[PDB]
Amino acid sequence: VNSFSGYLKLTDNVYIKNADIVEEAKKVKPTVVVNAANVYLKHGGGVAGALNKATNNAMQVESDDYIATNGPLKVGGSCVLSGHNLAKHCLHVVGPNVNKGEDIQLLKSAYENFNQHEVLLAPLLSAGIFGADPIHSLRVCVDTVRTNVYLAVFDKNLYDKLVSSFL
Numbered sequence: 244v245n246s247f248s249g250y251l252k253l254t255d256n257v258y259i260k261n262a263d264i265v266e267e268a269k270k271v272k273p274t275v276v277v278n279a280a281n282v283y284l285k286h287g288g289g290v291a292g293a294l295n296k297a298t299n300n301a302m303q304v305e306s307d308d309y310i311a312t313n314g315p316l317k318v319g320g321s322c323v324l325s326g327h328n329l330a331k332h333c334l335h336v337v338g339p340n341v342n343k344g345e346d347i348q349l350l351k352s353a354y355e356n357f358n359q360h361e362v363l364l365a366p367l368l369s370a371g372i373f374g375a376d377p378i379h380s381l382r383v384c385v386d387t388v389r390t391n392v393y394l395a396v397f398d399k400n401l402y403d404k405l406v407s408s409f410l
């Protein structure tokens with residue numbers, strides 16, 4: 244049994260809800276919240292920017308030190324950093340950004356990072372300002388992630404379309 248509430252059921256392991264991931268993280272304090280990161284861990288806009296704002300920029304400070312030591316992530320890669328006031332840990336995952344011309348086949352590699360964690364609160368990778376089709380992102384999620392994932396979808400209209408169209 245876990246703390247996640249109101250999540251709609253998709254498969255054995257994937258659950259979905261219309262929610263603000265910041266507000267959901269603040270309520271649940273999950274072991275892992277996933278950030279929709281870029282390779283530079285520059286959290287200016289999108290989920291990364293909303294999560295970072297909710298940490299009062301502490302996520303960005305920690306991320307800048309990580310990059311100064313380790314260099315950029317790979318597209319499709321991830322790192323585990325603090326969850327600050329939102330979660331125990333934040334898994335920063337880099338999905339391909341279609342608005343930068345990145346290979347969408349890297350989306351499966353991105354979701355494979357989730358399998359290293361038994362339970363996660365996450366957004367749909369490569370959706371929103373990353374430019375991918377969220378229906379496609381949900382399909383790759385369900386077909387890739389084997390661990391228990393609780394997906395938060397910010398837009399109510401999109402949530403309803405994702406549920407209604409789910410095979």
Ligand SMILES: Nc1c2c(nc3ncnn13)CCC2
Nearest residue numbers: 263264265289290293371397
């Ligand atoms: N959960 C959010 C928030 C914001 N912008 C977003 N863009 C995608 N998701 N997302 C600002 C308020 C919270």
